[PDB]
């Protein structure tokens, strides 16, 4: 049993309305300390060889479903459940 | 300068349509190894005393904007940018 | 061929951090005319009897996947593609 | 008082992982009638001249906050609350 962690974000360089909105709404409420906000989708996949082979598999999941390379960047962390 | 990381999820015990959907769509495509999926929103707040005081501040941001305790659970990690 | 439209929102009475955030960020930028914001997920399902029977089917999709009654309210519109 | 409705979607031609996922998870559960799914974010803005002038204003909100033209397409409907 392994836990794969998939972080998905917008391509580097693409402005993110969600981040910008959170920032401004935060400053609006008084938190002027907040200088910048960014958001991501975190996807935890719990699945059944070894971590490198798992990473390969989720890599495929991303490639053909989870993320769109044109607008998305993503990264995968695989930890064995012990 | 500090980087506060806010993870927001649904209350423990509430079924999440997104997780369930991802799982089934994943099994549907062949990845029968995938046994369970869960999703979270990750919010990175870059802001300007010390980490415990920062955590207190984002704690407030959550309390009055970022998350709704009725339907949300959340956790905060604060790292000093060095 | 029919187009089913599924609108999903938070239960009536549950505060929505997204709506609140958008509002404040909007006022923050100058749009003080904006008095209130609300957000929804719109899901267009294109599928293959008649509209009432389709509505029944998507009703089931919602019931067992698309939405969680505990935290979600939803409504379904079915139009025949002509 | 007017209700502006903002529909935001991915640019025409960009594959949407959410839509694809919903479709497959739906077929996976038996709903083979479902042939295609698409998703959108609906944003209802309740605000305070006349509908054409309101549309202009939300147009600006979109242009500078709500949506990113590079990855987003959007449309605005303005109805006077009567």
Judged by helices, strands and strand pairing, the structural class of chain A is alpha+beta
* Biggest interface and residues each: A-B, 29 and 29 residues
- Count of separate DSSP helical elements of chain A: 2
Instruction: List how many beta strands of chain A DSSP finds.
Output: 3
CATH-defined topology of chain A: Mth169, Chain: A
Q: What are the secondary-structure elements of chain A, in order, as H or E?
A: EHEHE
In the CATH hierarchy, the architecture of chain A is: 2-Layer Sandwich
Multimeric state: homotetramer
In CATH, what is the class of chain A?
A: Alpha Beta
Biggest sheet descriptor of chain A: 3 strands, antiparallel
Strand order of the largest sheet of chain A: 2-1-3
GO molecular function (chains A, B, C, D): ATP binding; phosphoribosylformylglycinamidine synthase activity
Protein name (chains A, B, C, D): Phosphoribosylformylglycinamidine synthase subunit PurS
Keywords (chains A, B, C, D): ATP-binding, Cytoplasm, Ligase, Nucleotide-binding, Purine biosynthesis
InterPro entries (chains A, B, C, D): PurS, PurS-like_sf
Please explain how this structure is put together:
Four copies of one chain form a homotetramer. Chain A has helices at 17-28, 51-66, and strands at residues 2-10, 34-47, 72-80. With 82 residues, chain A is of the alpha+beta class. The longest helix of chain A has 16 residues, at 51-66. Chains in contact: A-B, A-C, A-D, B-C, B-D, C-D. Chain A binds chain B through residues 1, 7, 22, 25-26, 29, 31, 33-48, 57, 60-61, 64-66, and chain B through 1, 7, 22, 25-26, 29, 31, 33-48, 57, 60-61, 64-66. Chains A, B, C, D: Keywords: ATP-binding, Cytoplasm, Ligase, Nucleotide-binding, Purine biosynthesis. Chains A, B, C, D: Its EC number is 6.3.5.3. Chains A, B, C, D: This is Phosphoribosylformylglycinamidine synthase subunit PurS. Chains A, B, C, D: One of its GO terms (biological process) is 'de novo' IMP biosynthetic process.
